């Protein structure tokens, strides 16, 4: 009764997370795999996120926590979950707003299902800035993006998490190939041990 | 331009918090004072609280955080705020559900406006159990009430907070008299220093 893997895709805005997450799920299914995106706008907590920045940070964490019974059930059924943004983006975005410390930002997400694999989609900030995605002012805020990346860097220092850096500057097919190999390795190997808990 | 005091009334279910909070505000106004109750059911976050216990805990904290701009503005205007339950009840109730540690429960409320006075309405659990208030199953859950009290006790160990224990077993008028003297002392004295931050 082999459990599914919990795979998280992280990285700055326009790194290719939505593109690569959908590509991964569909390729795995062509294995039992499902896609999860944070924030999940469909729930009641998600509908509130559609000001007070601490409330917003907590609402983003409560949106992750409300999906925990679903996460655990799917994983126990043998379904691998591909997650487009998790607690790491939560800490990075609030940390990019800068008013609050990394320690305060991490705390609400402490205890969440620990990912078996955290894919960090790395690319130069100037490389992501020249990408075909618009619709958010924060994309053009260079300073915000630099602070968000600094937050991601500090979070990668945690030796307990299975962080795997992927060169996100490469072609759609080459980035997919790297993500596919690492994800398949996680489904076969990382699933041997029971599902852990984030930052504890 | 003397700021208002932030006064919090705490204690187990049926200690007399709703009774004493309304009595205090109206007596002070007979001074500029307003009543605040947590949870505040009128807001959007409050409307969600009207399951997943971590999400609920975070929603209760986000409900406190959304009132922070209002709290700071009222206090700066010279309005004393009388608060019926705060972060202490947040930590006590989730702690009474028991699955989570006091440290995790405290973290989301870290940074909130620090009360100038925390009134703890003490009375024997058996004294509160024989009181004229019903409508909640948790009132009859003796074990839950004992754990909630244990959580309140641990929170009172914090030497940085101005905790004042009041004998809540006494008559409505005698409990009011004690709360009135301590509240008036806080309005005159505690307001000298700037508004602090909870648990930091
Ligand atoms: N390897 C790639 N090379 C160039 N553009 C890409 C690549 N992968 C994705 N994109 C494009 O970059 C933009 C952002 O991709 P997206 O998947 O939305 O990233 P994210 O979800 O990380 O913000 C989109 O316009 C997408 O089509
Ligand atoms: N000093 C008191 N002696 C006896 N009953 C009291 C006293 N103060 C309040 N009560 C009653 O006890 C019950 C709970 O009071 P309440 O203000 O709702 O407490 P809480 O808000 O702490 O749960 C009510 O029925 C109230 O009328
Ligand atoms: C997880 C997570 C995400 N975001 C950023 C919020 C992103 C939601 P959007 O900007 O409306 O949509 P796209 O970034 O997908 O284009 C955040 O601020 N905190 C979080 O915990
Ligand atoms: C602050 C706060 C309160 N409560 C308990 C929730 C109480 C709301 P009710 O039980 O519906 O109403 P009455 O207790 O006033 O009768 C909680 O669980 N967490 C908190 O942060
Ligand atoms: Mg995306
Ligand atoms: Mg009450």
Swiss-Prot record, chains A, B:
Keyword Acetylation listed: yes
Cofactor: Mg(2+)
EC number: 2.7.4.9
Reaction(s) catalysed (UniProt annotation): dTMP + ATP = dTDP + ADP
Resulting phenotype, residue 87 to T: In CONPM; uncertain significance
Keywords recorded for this protein, A-Z: Acetylation, ATP-binding, Disease variant, Intellectual disability, Kinase, Neurodegeneration, Nucleotide biosynthesis, Nucleotide-binding, Transferase
Superkingdom: Eukaryota
GO cellular component, one term: cytoplasm
Pfam families registered for this protein in UniProt: Thymidylate_kin
Annotated family: Belongs to the thymidylate kinase family.
The protein's role, per its UniProt record: Catalyzes the phosphorylation of thymidine monophosphate (dTMP) to thymidine diphosphate (dTDP), the immediate precursor for the DNA building block dTTP, with ATP as the preferred phosphoryl donor in the presence of Mg(2+).
Disease named in the record: Neurodegeneration, childhood-onset, with progressive microcephaly: An autosomal recessive disorder characterized by global developmental delay apparent from infancy. Most severely affected individuals have severe and progressive microcephaly, early-onset seizures, lack of visual tracking, and almost no developmental milestones, resulting in early death. Less severely affected individuals have a small head circumference and severely impaired intellectual development with poor speech and motor delay.
The protein's name in its UniProt record: Thymidylate kinase
Organism field: Homo sapiens
Gene name per UniProt: DTYMK
